[PDB]
C-alpha cells in the first residue's frame, strides 16, 4: 500500500507547488501547519517560521506574477515513516522567461517534510539549496 | 518536551560519530537507504551510505587534527511517536593546512525514524559550507 | 520564565518603534543617555538619541515602502533583577530600487536597567547590515 | 565612581588572560553560561566556552609573538551594584609573520555580573576585526 | 550505407520539426519515454517531451525569424536494423535581438528504435551552446 | 525479462569506467568497438575515434594514476531497444583527492550506446558533457 | 602573367557582391559546391551557398553604409591553365552606428576553377576578423 | 574515388613530417615557392620553406614530448587533374609545463598542384590555434 | 574645567557656522591668519581663510539639506589661559544625492587662542573623509 | 622676542624628531607630557595616548632599525599663543631604502603643539596624516 | 642652396598638412605622386597605397569637419638626398576638441619622402606612427 | 630594376649587422647624422648611431641566441639615381627565456642615399614591435 | 627684497588672466618665442603662444564658472637685476561638471625676464594634471 | 651664440656627474640654495643638496651598470650675461633589473646663474618618472 501512497504524497507537494507558482497565500497557509519552518537561500542561513516569512514573497511578488513558468519535480523520493508523517526529496527544476523574454532554467534542492494532521496532510518543515528562485 | 530531548542526544551521538569517524557507528544509526543533499553531491540526492563512504576513508578517520561541532538552537518537529524531524545551525571549528583555528557554517535538515525502538537516519539535507 | 518573558516583551516595543518611526515611544523606552555601536556609527560609540534621531527625521517619508523585521532566537541573562541583557539575530525583508525583495541580517545585544519599575534601554551594539 | 575603575580592571584582566593564553584564568572571570557575537562566530550567538576553548588550545604558533591591547575610551553603565556594562574600541598592536608592525580595531561590549566577591563576565559582543 | 541516408533523412525532419515550433510532428517522431541531456536542462536527465513544451510554446512557434539548422558531416552507427545512433555536430543560424545573424554550435547525440516500420526517437544528448 | 537484461547493461558499463579508472587499456580495446566515436570536453567540440584518441589519455594519466577516486553512477536510465542495442544514460559523480589532499566532486553527463556483436557487447558511442576528468 | 590580373578581377567582382549583398552573382560566380573556413562558421567547414545565404537575406540594415575593400599584394599561384589560387590580406574601411571611420584586417585564401567559360569559385578560408 | 584518396594520402605524409621534425621530406612535398597564412606568421602571407625552417631547427630536441596529432573529416576538391584543394580539422594533444595533458584544435587549407608527376604543396592557410 | 566646556562650545559654534554655511560669523571666530591641513588641501598646508571661501560660496551656503554634526569623546589641552588644543573625532550625517542618510568621519585637531577676549581659530588639522 | 620664541620652537621639534629617528624613547619621554594625544593613520582614526601606543614602535621597530633614513621638514609654520603656547606644522618628507634596498619617498603632514611647562617645553598633542611611518 | 632646399621642402610639406586638415583630396591628389605607399596606424600594420585608402578618410570625415584644429610640427629634420629627393621627419601635435567639446591632444610621429619629378615636388611615401587620426 | 634589388641586399645587410651585433658593419652602413624614430625613442627622433651603440653593446653583441628575420614584400622608391626609400613588414622569429619560438612584427621605413660609391642609411622609422 | 615681490606682483597677474581667460594680457606679459613644459604637451617643449591660444578661445575665455587659484610659498631666484626665476606649488579650486568643488594641484616654474622696462614670461614649466 | 654652447657643455657635464655618482662634481656646479622640482619629491619644492645626497650616496655613486644619457633638442633663453635657462627632453638609457636595456623619458628644466666667474645650478624642473 505505499506506491499509492507515495502518490498522495507526491499529489500533496504537487498542489503547494503550484500554489507558489500562482501566489496563491490563502491555499498556501492551509496545507502548512502554523509552524512550520524553513532553510532557503533568501533566509540567509538561518532557520525561519515558514508562513510568516513567506507571507512577505506572496504578498509583493508571486501575487503579481503574471510571467510563464513552468516547474518540474525531477525523480522525487519519499520516504515514508509510518502513516502519518512522510519526506520527499527532489530537484526542482524551473523554466522561465527573462525581462528580455529569452528562455532561463534553474535549479534547486528540496526537502519537504508532511505530517498528517486530522486526516489532512501538512507541510511542517522545508529545506530549499540552491536557486532562490 | 521530554521528546524533543530525545531526538537531540540521539543526533549528536550521529554527529560525534562523523566527527571521530566512526563509520560502522555512524551505519548502525542510518537507514540502509537513506537519502542526502549536501554540498558535496553537486546538487544531486545520493545514497547517504555509498557517497560518504570517501569521506570516511580519506578525511575524519585519522583524528590528526581537532574538531569541534555545535548545534546552535535546534528546532524539533515531532510526527507522532515514530517520527522526528530536527533542523539546526551547524558550527564547526577546525584547522587549516596551517594549523590555524577556522570556523564553517552550515544548516542541516535531518529525519528521523523509529523503528523497533532505535531511532533509524533516513534522510539529511546540508546546505552551506562545501566542506564538511 | 516571565521574568525573562518581560524583556523581550520591552525590546520588541522598541524594535516596532524603529520600523514605524516612533520616535516618541522610542525615547521613553530609552536612558538620555544611552550608548550605541552600530554599522552607521562607522565603529564608534555613540550616546544618546541624538544620532539616531536624523535616521527618524529623514526616513519617515518612505513609509510606502513595506518591510518586515523578524527576531530570531533572543538569548537573555538575568544579573539580578534591576538588570538584564538580550541577545538576537534580526532579519529585515524589504524592497529595493527594482521593486525585488531582498534579506538583510545583523546581529544585535541590548541591555536594559530597572530606574524607578521602568525598563530603560541603556545600551545596544549592531553588526552585520546596516538598517535598510 | 571608584566602582567603574573596579570594572575597567577587571575587564583589562580578562583581556589579558585572551593575550596570554590563560584560559583558566579565562574560565574563572567568565560565567559558565556566556554567549558572545563575535566575527569569529559567522553572526551566530555562541555558547560562550565551549567555542572559545577551541581557539585558547591551538593559537599555541603565537605565544612567541608581541602584542599590546589598549582600550580606548571605555563607556561604563552601572545597572544597581551587582551588574555592569562596559562599551570600548579595541586596538591591537602586534607584529606579523614578515615582522612589521600592524594595528587592529574591534569594538567590543562586554556585561559584568558581581557573583559573591568576583565579577563575573556573562555576555559579549565584538565586531570589526577577528581576534584570530 | 543506403540505410545510413534512412537516418540521416528522419533525423533532419526532427530537427525542421524543431526549426518550425511543429510540437505535434516532433512528438509522433518520439518515444514517449524519450530521456534527454541538454545544457537547458542544467546537468540533469530529463523528459524529452515534458521539458521541451516550455520551448514549443514559448520560443519556436511564431517563426518571426529565419532560422537555419545544419547537420554537419553526421556519424551514423547501425545496430542491427532495429537500432541507429547517429552523432553530428549542429550549426544554427539566427537573428539576435538586434536582428543580426549569429551562429551558434552544439553537439548531438541521438538514439532511434525502430518499431513496427516507423523510427522512433528514444534519446538525445546535446552539449555546447546553451540556448536552442 | 528486461529487469535482469538492463542489469546486464548496468554491469558491462560499470566495468567499463573501472577500466577507465585503473587505466587499463587493454580491456578498455576490448569492449569498444574498434570504430567508436566520442563527444567529450577534451575533444574540444569535436566527434572523434573514441580508442586512438583516448589512448594518449590512457598512457600518459590514467595508467599513472595512484590517488584514490571513487565513481557513482546516479540513476541509471536504460534505453532497451530490440536484443542487440542499447542506450544507457546517468549521472557520473566523481570524487577525489586534489595535490593537497583536500576532497573535492566532479559531475559529468555521460550517454553510452552498446551493441552486441557476437554475444558481447561493444561499446560504440558515447557522449560526455560537463566536467573533463 | 596576365592570366594572374584575370584571378585579380574575378576575385575582386565576387568581394564587390559580397559588399553591395548581390547574392544572385554570388551564387553566379560560386561552384554550388564550395566549402569554406571562415570566423562565423566557429572552427568548422560548412558547404558553401546554403551557410552564406543566411548572411545576404538579413544584413538588409547595413546596405546604407559606405564600406571601401582593399586586397593588400595578392598571390596567385596558377596550377595549370583552369585553376589558381589567390591569397591576399583584405582590409575593410567602414563606418560604424557612431559614424566614426573603422578598419578590419583579415587573411584570405580563395580557389579557383575555370569552368566552362568563366571563373568558379570552389573553396575559401578566411582568418582574423569575421565578416559581419 | 582513389583520385582523391592520392591527395589526403600526399597530405597526411607531409603533417607527419612536422610532427617528427623530418625537413627533409617536408621539402620535398613543397614547392619551393609555397605560401601560408598561418598564427605564428601574426596575420602576413610568408613565401618559401624559410619561415618554417626556424621550428624545425629549434623544436626537434624536445622529441622527448610525446604528441599526438589526429586529422578530421577531410573535404577535396578537384580542379582538373593537376590540381587538388583539401580542407580539414586537426586536432593535437600534448601535455604542458605540468605534466598535464592538453588539446588544441585548428583549421587547416592545403594546396596542391601537379608538376612532374609528383604533388608539389603550393599553399597552406591555417587559422586557430599555433602549433604547439 | 569650565575652561574646557568654553572651548568644547566655541568650536561647535565654529562647526555649526561651518555646516550652516555663514562665512561671515566663521570669520570672525577665525584668526585671519589661520592655517589649515586638510584632504582638501592635496597635503599642504594653506592659510583657512583664503582656501575656505570658496567652499563657503559655492557649497555650503546654498546648502538646504538636514546635516547633523557629532563631536565624539573630546580631548581639550589648556595650555594656560589664553590657549587651547582640542582633539575629536567628527561624524556628520547627511543626505546624498539619493536622498539616502550616509556617515562620514574625519578626525580633527583645531587650536584656539583667546585674544583680547575673544576666543579665536589658528590652526585646523583634518584627516579622514574629504568632506565638501 | 617672538622670533627668539619661534626659533625655541623650532629647535625643540628637531629634538624630538632626532630622538623618533634614532629610536631613543628615554629622550622621547622626557619631552612629552605623560598625557600627550595622537592623531595617526597607525592609529585608525581614533585618539590615543601619545606614549603608550608609541611605545610598541620604538620597542620593536624603530630603536633596532640603522637604515639609512633622511627627514625634510618642509615650510615650517609657527603659531605663538601667548608666552607658554606653541604649535608648529609642516610637511614631512621622509626617504628611506625598501627591502630591495632602493631609495623611496613618503609625504606626511604633522601638526605638534607644545606646552611650556616650568622651564621645559612638553610635547602634548600630535596629528599626523598621510604615510604610515 | 642646401638651405634654400630645406625651406623649400619646409614649405611644400606644410601644403600637404593644410589640405589634409581642410579635407581638400583634390590639392591632396596633385601633391601625392599616384603610387605613394604609406604606414600608419589605420592600416593595421599593412602598407597601402595612400591614395586609395585614403580617400575613405577625405569623403567621410576630414572634408566635413569644420571643428577647430590645430597641428604643431615639432623639431622637423630634413635628409637631402641629391637634388631631386627629400625626407622630413617631425613629431606632430594635434589640438582638437572631442564630443564634449574639451580640448584634447595627440602626438605623432612623421616621416614624409618627397621627390622631385618635372619641377614639382610629390608626395612618394609616409611613414606615421603613433595616434590615429 | 636591378637598382631595387641593390636597394633590398644592402637593407637585408644591415639587418643582419643588426641580428649578429656588429656594430662595426652597421656604423659602416650608416649616415653619421642618421636620424630615428622607435618605439625605444618613446616618440623622439634621436641620432640613430649614438642612440642604438647602447644596444649593441649590451645586448645584441652578446647574443648567441638563433634569430631568423624576414623581410616582407618590401617596397622600393627609387628617387633618381643617389636616392631610395625602401618600406616593408619585418619579421623577426627568436626563442625567448623559455626557449619557445616566438614572432615579433614591426614596419619600417628606411631610407638610403648613395653617397661617393656606397649606400648609406640616412632615416629610418620603426612601428609596431619595441625590438630590444 | 623689493624685485622679489615685482616677480610675485607680475606672476599673479599672469595667472589672473589665465583664470579669467584674458589672452590679450596673456600676450603683453609673454615673450612671443615663449616656451613651455606642460602635461597638456605629451613631454614635448612647444614654442609660442599658439598651444595655448587654442585653450583661451574654446575654454578659458568663455568660462563663466568660479575658479580661485593659490600660489604656495613661492621660491624666487634673482639673477642680477634682469631675470628672475619663480617656483611654487599652484593650488586650483574649480567646479566640475556636476557642479561640485573639486581641488587640482600642479608645480610651476616661470622664468622672466627684464627687457627695457617690462618683466616677459620666457619659460614655463608644469607638472602634475592638465 | 657661444654662450648658448658655453650652457649645453656645463649641462652636460651636470648630466655626466648624475650618471656616474660623482657628488663631488655635482656639489661644485651647485648653488648650496638650489632648488628643485622632480617626482621623488611627491609635488613638493626641496631646498639644497640633502635631499638628492640621498641618492647618490645609496644609488648612483655604486652603480657600475652603463647609463646613457641624451638630451633632445635643447632650448637655451639667454637673460643677459649672467643667467641662462635651459629646456630638453631627456632620454636614458639603462639597464633593469633582468639586465635588459630598457628607455624612460623626462623632461628638464635648469636655470644658471654666472656668479663671479663661475657658472651655478640654481633651481631645476624635472617631471616623468623617478
Ligand atoms: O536600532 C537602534 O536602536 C538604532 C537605530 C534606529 N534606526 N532607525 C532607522 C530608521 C528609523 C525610522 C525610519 Cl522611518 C527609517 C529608518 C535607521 C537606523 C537606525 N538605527
Ligand atoms: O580583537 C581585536 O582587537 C582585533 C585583533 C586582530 N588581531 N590579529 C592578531 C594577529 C593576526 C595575525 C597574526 Cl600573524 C598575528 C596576530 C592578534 C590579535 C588580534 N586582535
Ligand atoms: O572580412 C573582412 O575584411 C573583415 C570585416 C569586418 N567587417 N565589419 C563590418 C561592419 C561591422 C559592424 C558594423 Cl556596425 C558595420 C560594418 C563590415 C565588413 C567587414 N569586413
Ligand atoms: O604546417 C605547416 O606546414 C607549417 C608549420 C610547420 N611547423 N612545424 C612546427 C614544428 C616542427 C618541428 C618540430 Cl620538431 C616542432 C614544431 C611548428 C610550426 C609549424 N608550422
Not at 27 to 37: L, Q, R, V
Not at 112 to 128: A, E, F, S, Y
Amino acid at each position: 500500500p505505499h506506491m499509492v501512497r507515495k502518490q498522495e504524497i507526491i499529489k500533496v507537494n504537487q498542489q503547494l507547488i503550484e500554489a507558489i507558482s500562482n501566489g496563491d497565500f490563502e491555499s498556501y497557509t492551509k496545507m502548512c501547519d502554523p509552524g512550520m519552518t524553513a532553510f532557503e537561500p533568501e533566509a540567509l542561513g538561518n532557520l525561519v517560521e515558514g508562513l510568516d516569512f513567506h507571507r512577505f514573497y506572496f504578498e509583493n511578488l508571486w501575487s503579481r506574477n503574471s510571467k510563464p513558468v513552468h516547474n518540474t519535480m525531477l525523480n522525487p523520493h519519499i520516504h515514508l515513516m509510518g502513516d502519518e508523517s512522510a519526506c520527499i526529496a527532489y530537484i526542482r527544476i524551473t523554466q522561465y522567461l527573462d525581462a528580455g523574454g529569452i528562455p532561463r532554467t534553474a535549479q534547486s534542492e528540496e526537502t519537504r517534510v508532511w505530517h498528517r494532521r486530522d486526516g489532512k496532510w501538512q507541510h511542517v518543515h522545508m529545506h530549499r539549496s540552491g536557486a532562490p528562485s
